[PDB]
Amino acid sequence: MVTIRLARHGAKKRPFYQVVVADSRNARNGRFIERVGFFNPIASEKEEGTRLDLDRIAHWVGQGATISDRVAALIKEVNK
Amino acid sequence: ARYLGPKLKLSRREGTDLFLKSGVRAIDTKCKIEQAPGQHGARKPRLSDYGVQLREKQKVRRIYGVLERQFRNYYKEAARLKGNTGENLLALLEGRLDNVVYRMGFGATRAEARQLVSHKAIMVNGRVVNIASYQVSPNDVVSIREKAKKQSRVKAALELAEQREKPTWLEVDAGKMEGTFKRKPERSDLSADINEHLIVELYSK
Amino acid sequence: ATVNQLVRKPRARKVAKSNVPALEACPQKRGVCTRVYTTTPKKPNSALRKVCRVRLTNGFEVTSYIGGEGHNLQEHSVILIRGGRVKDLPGVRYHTVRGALDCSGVKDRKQARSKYGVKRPKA
Amino acid sequence: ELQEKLIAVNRVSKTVKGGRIFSFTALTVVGDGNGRVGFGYGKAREVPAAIQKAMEKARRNMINVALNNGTLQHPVKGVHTGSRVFMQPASEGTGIIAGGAMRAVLEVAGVHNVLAKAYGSTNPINVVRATIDGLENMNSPEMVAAKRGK
Amino acid sequence: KIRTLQGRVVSDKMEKSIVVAIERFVKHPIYGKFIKRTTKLHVHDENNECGIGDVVEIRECRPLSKTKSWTLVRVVEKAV
Amino acid sequence: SMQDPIADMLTRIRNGQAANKAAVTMPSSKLKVAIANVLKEEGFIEDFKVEGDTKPELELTLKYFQGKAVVESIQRVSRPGLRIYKRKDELPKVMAGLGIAVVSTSKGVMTDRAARQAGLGGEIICYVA
RNA sequence: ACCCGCAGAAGAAGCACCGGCUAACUCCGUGCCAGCAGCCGCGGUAAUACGGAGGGUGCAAGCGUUAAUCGGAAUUACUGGGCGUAAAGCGCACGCAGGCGGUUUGUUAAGUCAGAUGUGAAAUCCCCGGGCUCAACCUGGGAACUGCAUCUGAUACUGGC
RNA sequence: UAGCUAGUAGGUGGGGUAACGGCUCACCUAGGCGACGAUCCCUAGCUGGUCUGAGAGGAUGACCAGCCACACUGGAACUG
């Protein structure tokens, strides 16, 4: 019922990709419960483009929320 | 937008120099200022208070070539942080790239400087520029591209820049043809004839 | 000067509504010609003013002015109108405009052509 | 350091035997750019001579005030008939603001920023002479020390 | 403490209801004066200690009838 | 004027100095003598005298020094019907900061200078220049 | 996406306006006619307003033009008005609810203000960054959103006893 | 717009429901509301907000945020 998922942002052609905890109900980008990081595609050519709150994520998935396999693969990019 | 009359027609209607159609003659010749005043102003009109006002508003605009919708935007930006529209307006015109490329001597006029940007001949901070209506800030570096350094109009503009007072707001080197902005301009350091008495009271009664 | 009276009788204001009410908030309206005529001679201004009566699908019928030099408008012809007062006419607040299937265009016009709509002369 | 300002100038019409006659009238102020201003009205044949008659009235009396930071010592009120004028002191060198029928009376006395407003009827002679009544309403210093401040 | 109100009994004979008036002040949104506002409700009573124009103390309970979701606790003046 | 006796307290003073009088008289009350000490403490008056007990009257002696009047403006803003309330940080600065505002708080009258320091607000009594 | 070149002026300017308000107009055409507007009106043989010639003035891949919503409009006044005569006291006496009410000791604490716990989401207005031709925008942080809901305190004052 | 209800106004026992309720069948009475504007027709979904202005106020909700209603037009049940 609640998933740790992606939110595209940036309207047309200019995505920002935020990672959020959200219900399967209502919104597809906004209306989220808690933000847990970002996956920004244009990060000034620096490694600052990816952030993930692994402690809060572990508590959300522990308590019963779904973690996406796409986000589980991205946990490796913040070490680790 | 353009001006399709002879560019000295403006200065000959004003009875004052506006820095228009400039090159290796520098000043006064064959500007015919007060020698060919035309069909009006000899004989300078009294007219309405709405004269100065409009004809004084045009004289503070056309000297920078700025369009009315730009001029209203600079009046909005000059009305920021209590800086005074009689003062902080000058920084938005004198700090504009088609004035900076002119003050650096790459163009002999603000029109010719604006043309050099529309012809992609200029760089700002190592990247090419095509927009000339843009603000420059301290530590920004402006230069002419090697593919355009040999144009006779730039050659003449640099020889005219040596016949002009040097600005205290920006630097330029004639050997690299590269200049850098240093500080934003001030009324009592610009020390020249430009209005105050109308740019303190625009768009209101 | 008392404090609780406007709870008993709130004070009223005048809304400006319309001087061109048949438009129903549109820049133009289409209708049919019912009559083509000229107005009665009026004021020390001496002229022969061209007018038509126009009927609209919304229950309005209005008199409208026929600008431009010369016209041949028939009755039952479909026409467009635009709002605006003309004081040389009696109570007229509408202009009938030349974009019509039966109506003639203005001729011998080289300048000011964005009004009435005239194409640039050959040679 | 004498300076003069024209605020308004117009023609007038008058009835005579079987017809009318035309003449000129002006509204002016005169000041010293540092503490005083006087107000003038005048009518004449020829427009420069009408303006000059108003300048001579503006020299017939002047009001002398102790300007503070190029603005007002305190808030002031001025009145003439239906024309009521109020002025709040201005901060940060900005705040000007106010039309010529208030501003011209103050820009001739040395005022740089002021938050003046006019109320009621907008006959500019009445507004100008109510601005002068507001200059008779201002007080001097910053000396009596009767208040803690500020 | 529990939710209580005081008021005067407007209507006292309704078998198993009494009608109470509750008074408070509120600001008028345009004319700025704080004006009096009065609200009415039905209150449940089985014990008959009050009468018309007598003063009561009441609590909120469960909805039972049209505008009756409150019940009587005590009488506050009692003399008379 | 008995329907607003504190508006009348200000009226008697505003018209008293317009007539350039030294003394102003009114019927006495605890709030009028609480305000009279605020007016003495700002130096608009040099004395406030109560006579009678037995038709008690309050007589205020105006303090004329260094020129005409004792105040330039003396507005009440509040009214018994239209009561005007300010929060501790919404207290206005009267006379471009050269004047006082007075508030009744929850214990009695004080100036905006003291209401600021105490962290208090309340109903407006006067704005004085 | 982004960036660089090639022979060549190469394919490239129109629209409105010109007495008074509100700047630009001289000379003609017409001659109360024909056609303009926001308003007076412009026009009868020397019409700045209509049409034409040559120019001027403003804007420009636009230019003019308008229904529809606000400001100006204090012209409905809550901020912010008037009632002798311009716009208005309603022909004149009594009077219930409504609304108003001197001065002081208690007391309730609804209202008020204070304090605290929640709220005023994402945006957005304002200041300063990041990133896409400038800027918008999309984004990052501040500052705001002067408000609102409740639980305690104080009772100057309005209500209440 | 000066009339408006009538499961309306106040009680009683079952049945229905996750559960208040005249939800629903019976039975026990006759009121209840309103000029301090009840109530009914005409038009219209509402709001984050947007537009205007110094603000009050005025306008308005597409587009970007959030509910409701609605599924040829009218009507009936199941499933949950």
Swiss-Prot record, chain A:
<dbReference type="InterPro" id="IPR023803">
    <property type="entry name" value="Ribosomal_bS16_dom_sf"/>
</dbReference>
<comment type="subunit">
    <text>Part of the 30S ribosomal subunit.</text>
</comment>
<dbReference type="GO" id="GO:0022627">
    <property type="term" value="C:cytosolic small ribosomal subunit"/>
</dbReference>
<keyword id="KW-0689">Ribosomal protein</keyword>
<dbReference type="GO" id="GO:0000400">
    <property type="term" value="F:four-way junction DNA binding"/>
</dbReference>
<dbReference type="InterPro" id="IPR020592">
    <property type="entry name" value="Ribosomal_bS16_CS"/>
</dbReference>
<dbReference type="GO" id="GO:0005737">
    <property type="term" value="C:cytoplasm"/>
</dbReference>
<protein>
    <recommendedName>
        <fullName>Small ribosomal subunit protein bS16</fullName>
    </recommendedName>
</protein>
<dbReference type="InterPro" id="IPR000307">
    <property type="entry name" value="Ribosomal_bS16"/>
</dbReference>
<dbReference type="GO" id="GO:0015935">
    <property type="term" value="C:small ribosomal subunit"/>
</dbReference>
<dbReference type="GO" id="GO:0000028">
    <property type="term" value="P:ribosomal small subunit assembly"/>
</dbReference>
<keyword id="KW-0540">Nuclease</keyword>
Curated annotation (Swiss-Prot), chain B:
<keyword id="KW-0699">rRNA-binding</keyword>
<dbReference type="InterPro" id="IPR036986">
    <property type="entry name" value="S4_RNA-bd_sf"/>
</dbReference>
<dbReference type="GO" id="GO:0002181">
    <property type="term" value="P:cytoplasmic translation"/>
</dbReference>
<comment type="subunit">
    <text>Part of the 30S ribosomal subunit. Contacts protein S5. With proteins S3 and S5 encircles the mRNA as it enters the ribosome, which may play a role in mRNA helicase processivity. Some nascent polypeptide chains are able to cross-link to this protein in situ. The rRNA transcription and antitermination complex (rrnTAC) consists of RNAP, NusA, NusB, NusE (rpsJ), NusG, SubB, ribosomal protein S4, DNA and precursor rRNA; S4 is more flexible than other subunits.</text>
</comment>
<keyword id="KW-0687">Ribonucleoprotein</keyword>
<keyword id="KW-0806">Transcription termination</keyword>
<dbReference type="GO" id="GO:0031564">
    <property type="term" value="P:transcription antitermination"/>
</dbReference>
<keyword id="KW-0690">Ribosome biogenesis</keyword>
<keyword id="KW-0805">Transcription regulation</keyword>
<dbReference type="InterPro" id="IPR002942">
    <property type="entry name" value="S4_RNA-bd"/>
</dbReference>
<comment type="function">
    <text>One of two assembly initiator proteins for the 30S subunit, it binds directly to 16S rRNA where it nucleates assembly of the body of the 30S subunit.</text>
</comment>
<keyword id="KW-0046">Antibiotic resistance</keyword>
UniProtKB/Swiss-Prot annotation, chain C:
<dbReference type="InterPro" id="IPR006032">
    <property type="entry name" value="Ribosomal_uS12"/>
</dbReference>
<dbReference type="GO" id="GO:0006412">
    <property type="term" value="P:translation"/>
</dbReference>
<keyword id="KW-0694">RNA-binding</keyword>
<protein>
    <recommendedName>
        <fullName>Small ribosomal subunit protein uS12</fullName>
    </recommendedName>
</protein>
<dbReference type="GO" id="GO:0003735">
    <property type="term" value="F:structural constituent of ribosome"/>
</dbReference>
<dbReference type="GO" id="GO:0034337">
    <property type="term" value="P:RNA folding"/>
</dbReference>
<keyword id="KW-0820">tRNA-binding</keyword>
<comment type="similarity">
    <text>Belongs to the universal ribosomal protein uS12 family.</text>
</comment>
<dbReference type="GO" id="GO:0005737">
    <property type="term" value="C:cytoplasm"/>
</dbReference>
<dbReference type="GO" id="GO:0000372">
    <property type="term" value="P:Group I intron splicing"/>
</dbReference>
<dbReference type="GO" id="GO:0005840">
    <property type="term" value="C:ribosome"/>
</dbReference>
<comment type="subunit">
    <text>Part of the 30S ribosomal subunit. Contacts proteins S8 and S17. Interacts with ArfA. May interact with IF1 in the 30S initiation complex.</text>
</comment>
UniProtKB/Swiss-Prot annotation, chain D:
<dbReference type="InterPro" id="IPR020568">
    <property type="entry name" value="Ribosomal_Su5_D2-typ_SF"/>
</dbReference>
<dbReference type="GO" id="GO:0005737">
    <property type="term" value="C:cytoplasm"/>
</dbReference>
<comment type="subunit">
    <text>Part of the 30S ribosomal subunit. Contacts proteins uS4 and uS8. With proteins uS4 and uS5 encircles the mRNA as it enters the ribosome, which may play a role in mRNA helicase processivity. Can be cross-linked to mRNA. In collided ribosomes contacts ribosome rescue factor SmrB.</text>
</comment>
<comment type="function">
    <text>Located at the back of the 30S subunit body where it stabilizes the conformation of the head with respect to the body.</text>
</comment>
<dbReference type="GO" id="GO:0000028">
    <property type="term" value="P:ribosomal small subunit assembly"/>
</dbReference>
<comment type="similarity">
    <text>Belongs to the universal ribosomal protein uS5 family.</text>
</comment>
<dbReference type="InterPro" id="IPR005712">
    <property type="entry name" value="Ribosomal_uS5_bac-type"/>
</dbReference>
<dbReference type="GO" id="GO:0006412">
    <property type="term" value="P:translation"/>
</dbReference>
<keyword id="KW-0699">rRNA-binding</keyword>
<keyword id="KW-0007">Acetylation</keyword>
<dbReference type="GO" id="GO:0019843">
    <property type="term" value="F:rRNA binding"/>
</dbReference>
<keyword id="KW-0046">Antibiotic resistance</keyword>
